[PDB]
Design an enzyme around this catalytic site. Structure first.
Site, mmCIF file in Angstrom:
data_model
loop_
_atom_site.group_PDB
_atom_site.id
_atom_site.type_symbol
_atom_site.label_atom_id
_atom_site.label_comp_id
_atom_site.label_asym_id
_atom_site.label_seq_id
_atom_site.Cartn_x
_atom_site.Cartn_y
_atom_site.Cartn_z
ATOM 1 C CE1 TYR A 79 -3.614 -6.049 -26.036
ATOM 2 C CE2 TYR A 79 -4.663 -4.056 -26.264
ATOM 3 C CZ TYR A 79 -3.407 -4.355 -25.636
ATOM 4 O OH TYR A 79 -2.681 -4.306 -25.319
ATOM 5 C CG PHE A 128 -3.923 -8.834 -31.270
ATOM 6 C CD1 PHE A 128 -4.430 -7.956 -33.338
ATOM 7 C CD2 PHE A 128 -3.684 -8.488 -31.136
ATOM 8 C CE1 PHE A 128 -3.708 -6.949 -33.220
ATOM 9 C CE2 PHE A 128 -2.524 -7.688 -31.202
ATOM 10 C CZ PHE A 128 -2.294 -7.256 -32.466
ATOM 11 C CE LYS A 161 -3.371 -15.039 -31.788
ATOM 12 N NZ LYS A 161 -4.404 -13.748 -31.876
ATOM 13 C CE1 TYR A 162 -5.466 -15.907 -28.218
ATOM 14 C CE2 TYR A 162 -7.443 -15.386 -29.762
ATOM 15 C CZ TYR A 162 -6.608 -14.860 -28.957
ATOM 16 O OH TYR A 162 -5.904 -14.189 -29.509
ATOM 17 C CD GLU A 213 -1.155 -6.289 -21.698
ATOM 18 O OE1 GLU A 213 -1.102 -7.318 -22.356
ATOM 19 O OE2 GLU A 213 -0.224 -5.565 -22.221
ATOM 20 C CG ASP A 259 8.702 -4.445 -19.539
ATOM 21 O OD1 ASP A 259 8.639 -5.455 -19.535
ATOM 22 O OD2 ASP A 259 9.219 -3.396 -20.224
ATOM 23 C CG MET A 260 8.673 -9.900 -20.363
ATOM 24 S SD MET A 260 7.638 -11.122 -21.283
ATOM 25 C CE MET A 260 6.259 -10.318 -22.325
ATOM 26 C CD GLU A 293 -2.108 -13.617 -28.623
ATOM 27 O OE1 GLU A 293 -3.311 -13.747 -29.500
ATOM 28 O OE2 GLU A 293 -2.396 -13.195 -27.408
ATOM 29 C CD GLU A 326 4.299 -7.300 -32.427
ATOM 30 O OE1 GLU A 326 3.793 -8.239 -31.510
ATOM 31 O OE2 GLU A 326 2.957 -7.601 -33.518
HETATM 32 C C1 LIG Z 1 -1.646 -10.683 -32.177
HETATM 33 C C2 LIG Z 1 -0.619 -10.070 -33.084
HETATM 34 C C3 LIG Z 1 -1.162 -10.136 -34.408
HETATM 35 C C4 LIG Z 1 -0.687 -8.870 -35.002
HETATM 36 N N1 LIG Z 1 -1.050 -8.740 -36.480
HETATM 37 C C5 LIG Z 1 -1.461 -7.537 -37.159
HETATM 38 O O1 LIG Z 1 0.097 -6.854 -37.467
HETATM 39 C C6 LIG Z 1 -1.556 -7.344 -38.722
HETATM 40 O O2 LIG Z 1 -0.998 -8.925 -39.512
HETATM 41 N N2 LIG Z 1 -2.441 -6.376 -38.603
HETATM 42 C C7 LIG Z 1 -3.313 -6.600 -40.307
HETATM 43 C C8 LIG Z 1 -4.772 -6.619 -39.921
HETATM 44 C C9 LIG Z 1 -5.064 -7.837 -39.720
HETATM 45 C C10 LIG Z 1 -5.268 -5.882 -38.925
HETATM 46 C C11 LIG Z 1 -5.397 -5.650 -37.438
HETATM 47 C C12 LIG Z 1 -3.144 -5.974 -37.272
HETATM 48 C C13 LIG Z 1 -2.838 -4.220 -37.899
HETATM 49 C C14 LIG Z 1 -3.462 -3.271 -37.881
HETATM 50 C C15 LIG Z 1 -3.195 -1.783 -37.940
HETATM 51 C C16 LIG Z 1 -2.288 -1.767 -38.190
HETATM 52 C C17 LIG Z 1 -0.861 -2.913 -38.672
HETATM 53 C C18 LIG Z 1 -0.941 -4.365 -38.757
HETATM 54 C C19 LIG Z 1 0.996 -8.846 -34.409
HETATM 55 N N3 LIG Z 1 0.971 -8.459 -33.463
HETATM 56 C C20 LIG Z 1 0.536 -9.194 -32.410
HETATM 57 N N4 LIG Z 1 0.967 -9.266 -31.190
HETATM 58 C C1 LIG Z 2 -2.040 -9.054 -27.646
HETATM 59 S S1 LIG Z 2 -0.880 -8.702 -28.133
HETATM 60 C C2 LIG Z 2 1.170 -8.832 -27.974
HETATM 61 C C3 LIG Z 2 0.403 -8.067 -26.126
HETATM 62 O O1 LIG Z 2 1.822 -7.413 -25.147
HETATM 63 C C4 LIG Z 2 2.313 -7.134 -24.472
HETATM 64 N N1 LIG Z 2 3.745 -6.830 -24.059
HETATM 65 C C5 LIG Z 2 4.223 -6.713 -25.052
HETATM 66 N N2 LIG Z 2 5.784 -6.602 -24.144
HETATM 67 C C6 LIG Z 2 5.710 -6.840 -23.160
HETATM 68 C C7 LIG Z 2 6.422 -7.352 -22.270
HETATM 69 N N3 LIG Z 2 7.764 -7.011 -22.619
HETATM 70 N N4 LIG Z 2 5.777 -6.693 -20.742
HETATM 71 C C8 LIG Z 2 4.464 -7.177 -20.687
HETATM 72 N N5 LIG Z 2 4.047 -7.387 -22.066
HETATM 73 C C9 LIG Z 2 3.830 -6.940 -22.930
HETATM 74 C C10 LIG Z 2 1.264 -6.266 -24.937
HETATM 75 O O2 LIG Z 2 0.524 -4.818 -24.239
HETATM 76 C C11 LIG Z 2 0.147 -6.421 -25.905
HETATM 77 O O3 LIG Z 2 -0.581 -6.305 -24.557
#
Ligand SMILES: Cc1cc(NC(=O)C(=O)N2C[C@@H](C)CC[C@@H]2c2ccccc2)cnc1N
Ligand SMILES: CSC[C@H]1O[C@@H](n2cnc3c(N)ncnc32)[C@H](O)[C@@H]1O
EC number: 2.1.1.320
Lengths: 303, 625
Positions: free
Chosen positions: B312, B315, B321-322, B380, B407-408, B423, B432
């Site tokens: 987190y 992120f 991004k924000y 969350e 869970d949403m 996000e 995801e």
């Molecule tokens: C907000 C967000 C963000 C992400 N971002 C990623 O996965 C990603 O590209 N990385 C690569 C690097 C920036 C380090 C963090 C993460 C990572 C860490 C460890 C294993 C793989 C990936 C994915 N999903 C969401 N929702």
């Molecule tokens: C900020 S990364 C995405 C976030 O969404 C949350 N998330 C993913 N899927 C779900 C879901 N079905 N319900 C609630 N939260 C979720 C994950 O736990 C993570 O904190």
């Protein structure tokens, strides 16, 4: 820091013997130039007329007139060493680093004022020995230059051969100075070159398979060829005789002496490592001196 | 700065030489381990019985010095592919001898030449040594951009140099490397020492070496021009190639004699230093990602798994991004609530996957900026993050924010939302399962509500990287399919690779999805025009997303949001590399597949040759629902 690998042997007009030597193994990989006014005393250091140490090995060597010695260094340098007025010392005249890898072959041109060097950098260079500078640089080959050999009577003409499987006939008067000649097709790589002393237009080349070939420049067809050796032909030296003999050296550790039709007349196994050079006595035209990596100086009498 | 070594083929005294090159400022020395001119016999007497020593002593340097400072060089007389049988047999024995001595000394690297087309026996003998005890040593294959034959002076009267376009022929040197490396089965111990000539070839010839394991670049003294002062320098095109190579953090080797006599041998090196120090410094993205180049990671699954605190944290360290989420919420609030309703109309704003609350804070910053009243729910399912949210809510947010730990797709919302904010996007957008998650939350969006984001699209591009193909290959694990590592995606800061065609859109999702018949499965066919000779090792994946109207995020290279480091590209490998000729089309097929329990990708190349269907039925890779 002594040198047991004998690379070169060249008799001067007055019968004195020039030796070049490398250390190819042990702590120091250097080289040395010796002069023996008594040829029978060689290779023993204690009964030499003159000696000197070089920074690096000696791959090839040649007289420059009567006092001059021209050296193909491992360093990439071409070195000219002069002889003392009393011929006691051997002093460096010039050391010029112009090749990018080992200088493997040198040859003095007919004039005696210019020379040509061949290197593992694939280049060939023409030198002015008074001005101590490179006149021309030629990248004609596609691999290391094994052998360069000045025409006996023409300053603008010389042979070269290379692991690119080319024998080049050179004339520096032509705008494109090199010309490809040899047998009809795919040769085993050329390893050694010798101009005929009498015929401007003919030469011999040894190959890496042990064959010796007689070539006419004009006819560009291999007149004769014989299987002389079991391994690479490292040198070819014509005798001074009116109808000359051909001496051939090999990594097979043998000397052969051949007639004009390349038939076997003599053969010596006296060497027990590779045979590196040969010169015929200018005093006794039937005397032939060989040196090799076994640190032997053999004096053969040739019928 | 620059790590660089001296090349020498003449070493009278190893102590004196090593001391000279150290003084000159070099980091290491490439030198022969037997004298270059000392040919040895193994079969025929008497030369076979040559008295020793056969070379200089290991006692002349410390173990530390052999291990760190010395690169061995194979003797130039050694020709395992000679047409002469006696020279093949002798070179075989001599190669084993020199390589075995190298291993004896613990040398970090040994240099071998590729200087002709047939190196089959050379490869057989190296491969044989490699499989004689597991050792660390590297083999640097010395190969030029331009073959000597194609570089020679046009000076042979009866053998002229061709003045005609020879596109494939000018690449002949890459095919020497390719055939050698293939014979040796893509060993990770065999790299390239790329040798650079006076005259660079066409770019296409250079571009061939993109994606190749280049550990060294060799610069001969010849290629250095001279300037006003006398200093050795390089052509602006040579400088371009150096700058490319510095980004591959290669080692530079100086070979040949000092042609700039008036100047020292520090100068040549001092020029490379001058070049590396005077490049464009690292931007925010490059500086951030410096450690991650070509590092394979499994993709996060924030649905099936609970992310850690420190995940987190990264992120949240993405202010660009924000800012974009804030602006998208800002513009949405003004379009939905007229000025004269600002005190009366309180909008219901729901963050779906709120983690530790960065979108919650952006939502408040937005409402205060737009001067509109909002009511926040923070949803969350990761109960670990819920701890962070509830301490924030009691400490700072107060009753404006309601934290919801569920869970949403299950949550019975008390009222409907004006805006859902999420996000949930991976590197391939939908990887995801944002579609499935926001689908299950749709029923509590108002009939006229907005999803931020409203839209996302994945992109694919074919790539060449013999380096990443090897990194994937080395992810074999016991107790699973030997080839399973090729049938799953990786998140990676792709670095040593070649993009073979412009990215093209793969899969698109819209939220809300009003469709009576919702199917999140997909089948896409993409045709990639390729205008080079190359080898296909997989597909790079990126995404773009519309948050609201003109406000967007992108990691597609051409449209990449400047200064945003939350996401790296994804890599879909293929099991067997595929030859692609100049002019040919790469055709790839991708499916998004599902059941009650799992979502997965399947893929296949159908041109110019067919691959196996990768990841059939999710056997190697699935994303949990
Ligand atoms: C907000 C967000 C963000 C992400 N971002 C990623 O996965 C990603 O590209 N990385 C690569 C690097 C920036 C380090 C963090 C993460 C990572 C860490 C460890 C294993 C793989 C990936 C994915 N999903 C969401 N929702
Ligand atoms: C900020 S990364 C995405 C976030 O969404 C949350 N998330 C993913 N899927 C779900 C879901 N079905 N319900 C609630 N939260 C979720 C994950 O736990 C993570 O904190």
């Amino acid at each position: 820091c002594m040198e047991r690998q004998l690379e070169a042997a060249r008799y001067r007009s007055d019968g004195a013997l020039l030796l070049g030597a490398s250390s190819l193994s042990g702590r120091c990989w250097a080289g040395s130039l010796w002069l023996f006014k008594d040829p029978c005393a060689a290779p023993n250091e204690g009964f030499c007329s003159a000696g000197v140490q070089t920074e690096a090995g000696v791959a090839d060597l040649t007289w420059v007139g009567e006092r001059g010695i021209l050296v193909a260094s491992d360093s990439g340098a071409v070195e000219l060493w002069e002889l003392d007025e009393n011929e006691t010392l051997i002093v460096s005249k010039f050391c010029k680093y112009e090749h990018d890898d080992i200088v493997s072959t040198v040859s003095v041109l007919s004039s005696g004022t210019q020379a040509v060097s061949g290197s593992k950098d694939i280049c060939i260079k023409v030198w002015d020995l008074a001005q101590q500078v490179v006149l021309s640089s030629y990248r004609a080959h596609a691999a290391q230059v094994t052998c360069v050999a000045a025409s006996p009577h023409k300053d603008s003409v010389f042979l070269s051969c290379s692991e690119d499987n080319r024998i080049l006939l050179w004339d520096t008067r032509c705008p494109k100075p090199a010309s490809q000649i040899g047998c009809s097709a795919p040769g085993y790589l050329p390893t050694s070159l010798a101009w005929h002393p009498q015929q401007s237009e003919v030469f011999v080349f040894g190959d890496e398979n042990g064959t010796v070939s007689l070539v006419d420049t004009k006819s560009t067809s291999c007149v004769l060829s014989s299987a002389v050796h079991s391994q690479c032909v490292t040198g070819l030296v014509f005798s001074p005789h009116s109808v000359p003999f051909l001496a051939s050296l090999s990594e097979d550790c043998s000397l052969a002496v051949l007639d004009s039709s390349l038939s076997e007349l003599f053969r010596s196994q006296a060497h027990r490592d590779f045979v590196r050079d040969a010169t015929w006595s200018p005093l006794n035209h039937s005397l032939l001196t060989t040196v090799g990596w076994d640190h032997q100086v053999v004096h053969h009498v040739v019928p | 700065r620059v790590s660089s070594g001296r090349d020498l083929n003449c070493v009278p005294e190893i102590a004196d030489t090593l001391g000279a090159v150290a003084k000159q400022g070099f980091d290491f020395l490439c030198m022969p381990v037997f004298h270059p001119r000392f040919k040895r016999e193994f079969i025929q007497e008497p030369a076979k019985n040559r008295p020793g020593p056969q070379t200089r002593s290991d006692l002349l340097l410390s173990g530390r010095d052999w291990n760190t400072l010395i690169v061995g060089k194979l003797s130039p007389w050694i020709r395992p592919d000679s047409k002469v049988e006696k020279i093949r047999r002798n070179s075989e024995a001599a190669m084993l001898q020199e390589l075995n001595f190298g291993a004896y000394l613990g040398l970090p690297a040994f240099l071998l030449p590729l200087n002709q087309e047939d190196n089959t026996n050379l490869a057989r003998v190296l491969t044989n040594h490699i499989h004689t005890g597991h050792h660390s040593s590297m083999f640097w294959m010395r190969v030029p951009l331009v073959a000597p034959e194609d570089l020679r002076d046009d000076i042979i009267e009866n053998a002229p140099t061709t003045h005609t376009e020879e596109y494939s022929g000018e690449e002949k040197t890459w095919m020497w490397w390719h055939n050698f490396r293939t014979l040796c089965d893509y060993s990770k111990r065999i790299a390239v020492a790329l040798e650079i000539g006076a005259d660079l070839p066409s770019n296409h010839v250079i571009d061939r070496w993109l994606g190749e394991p280049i550990k060294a670049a060799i610069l001969p003294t010849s290629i250095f021009l001279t300037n006003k002062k006398g200093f050795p320098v390089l052509s602006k095109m040579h400088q371009r190639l150096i700058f490319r190579l510095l980004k591959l953090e290669v080692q530079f080797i100086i070979t040949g004699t000092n042609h700039h006599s008036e100047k020292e041998f520090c100068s040549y090196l001092q020029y490379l230093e001058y070049l590396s120090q005077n490049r464009p410094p690292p931007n925010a993205y490059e500086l951030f990602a410096k450690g991650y180049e070509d590092y394979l990671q499994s993709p996060l699954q924030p649905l099936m798994d609970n992310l850690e605190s420190q995940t987190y944290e990264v992120f949240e360290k993405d202010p660009i991004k924000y800012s974009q989420y804030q602006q998208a919420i800002y513009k949405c609030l003004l379009d939905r609530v007229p000025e004269e309703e600002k005190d009366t109309n309180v909008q219901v704003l729901m963050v779906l996957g709120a983690g530790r609350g960065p979108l919650v804070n952006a939502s408040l910053r937005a409402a205060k900026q737009a001067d509109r009243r909002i009511k926040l729910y923070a949803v969350e399912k990761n109960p670990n993050a819920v701890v962070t949210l509830e301490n924030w809510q009691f400490e700072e947010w107060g009753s404006q924010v309601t934290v919801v730990s569920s869970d949403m797709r299950e949550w019975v919302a008390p009222e409907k939302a004006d805006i859902i904010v999420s996000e949930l996007l991976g590197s391939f957008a939908d990887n995801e399962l944002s579609p499935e998650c926001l689908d299950g939350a749709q029923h509590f969006l108002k009939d006229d509500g907005v999803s931020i984001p409203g839209e996302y699209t994945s992109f694919l591009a074919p790539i060449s990287s013999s380096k990443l193909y090897n990194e994937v290959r080395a992810c074999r694990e016991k107790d699973r399919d030997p080839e399973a590592q090729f049938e799953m995606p990786y998140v990676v800061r792709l670095h040593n690779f070649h993009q073979l065609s412009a990215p093209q859109p793969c899969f698109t999702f819209s939220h809300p999805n009003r469709d009576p018949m919702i199917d999140n499965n997909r089948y896409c066919t993409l045709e990639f025009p390729v205008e080079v000779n190359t080898v296909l090792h997989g597909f790079a994946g990126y995404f773009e997303t519309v948050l609201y109207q003109d406000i967007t995020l992108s990691i597609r290279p051409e449209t990449h949001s400047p200064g945003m480091f939350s996401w790296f590209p994804i890599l879909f490998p293929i099991k067997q590399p595929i030859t692609v000729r100049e002019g040919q089309t790469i055709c790839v097929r991708f499916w998004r597949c599902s059941n009650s329990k799992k979502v997965w990708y399947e893929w296949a190349v159908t041109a110019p040759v067919c691959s196996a269907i990768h990841n059939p039925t999710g056997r190697s890779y699935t994303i949990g629902l």
